[PDB]
Homo-oligomer: A and B are copies of this chain.
Amino acid sequence: GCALPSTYKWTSTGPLASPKSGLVALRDYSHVIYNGQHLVYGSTANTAGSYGSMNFGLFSDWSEMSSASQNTMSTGAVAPTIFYFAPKSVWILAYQWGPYAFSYRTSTDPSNANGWSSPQPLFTGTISGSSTGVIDQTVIGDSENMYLFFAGDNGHIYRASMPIGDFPGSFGSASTIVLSDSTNNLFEAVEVYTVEGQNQYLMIVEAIGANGRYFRSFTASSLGGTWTAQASTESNPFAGKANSGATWTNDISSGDLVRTNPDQTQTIDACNLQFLYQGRSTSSGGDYNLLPYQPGLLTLA
């Protein structure tokens, strides 16, 4: 395939959807291709600043996202991750703020927002130094193990693992810290991907900059190994105001790179890098929980 870029630059769409009546924001997207169409799950914020979740109706082209249905989940699955777990032929939805520190549900009908199984434990542990507690999971496998990565709004990235034959199931309560920095430099919204054909993994993490939210990147040769800084500063980031080509938003915030293969390896084609991110109008302000986040798409330049 293609090696990761040494230096990142992008072009952007404008906003691709707006929240339906009774909602103020669409956040934290997770995307898969399902039956040749785009299947997107995400969080919601309502007029009171309370968080829930949803999916979009299946849509073929990004220009059609604005007319897709917005389907409210009856029990919330905030900051979701969706993937197909191939060894047991089942789709997985992982999330925070449910009955366990992280939870999951299963389905064979993932286009139905309300077709998921009863919640099961994904992780039951704790962290310290945090105003939020554990936040923003992702889940990724290799041929031997499944891995859980997450954040804490506290400058740390955490990891747990289990044998692949034990999944779906709980990772337990123990974790290991894999990265540490200032709170603003490693804040939240971590994502991890297999770089197709390159024997390498990509991690991206949301940071708080002087000029907006932006992403930093790291690389590894194994999911249980060391993470090395790649695009590390606000002025030369993975994706941010400095290199996004987006003028409708300053923020490039919590979302998902575009994955074509929907399986548990979270594989990206680095010949065709694209980023489904949350942004907000440059004129927006006030209460964080009421900010009008909505989706946009970056394509490498």
Contacts and interface: CB of A to CB of B under 8 A. Distances in A.
A99 interface: no
Best-surrounded residue of A127, A175, A180, A261 (most CB of chain B within 10 A) = A180
A144 B173 CA distance: 7
Interface stretch (A8-16, A37-45, A57-65, A190-198): A190-198
A150 to B, nearest CB: 13
Copies in the complex: 2
Contacts of A199: 176-177
Nearest to A3: B180
Contacts of A265: 128
Contacts of A142: 174
- Decide if the interface of chain A is mainly helix, strand, loop or mixed: loop
Nearest to A142: B174
Interface size class of A (residues with CB under 8 A): 20 to 34
A180 B143 contact: no
Contacts of A144: 173-174
A109 interface: no
B174 A143 contact: yes
A143 B265 CA distance: 28
Contact of A143 (B87, B125, B196, B260): B125
A127 B196 CA distance: 11
Interface of A: 1, 86-87, 125-129, 142-144, 155-156, 173-177, 180-181, 194, 196-199, 260-261, 263, 265, 267
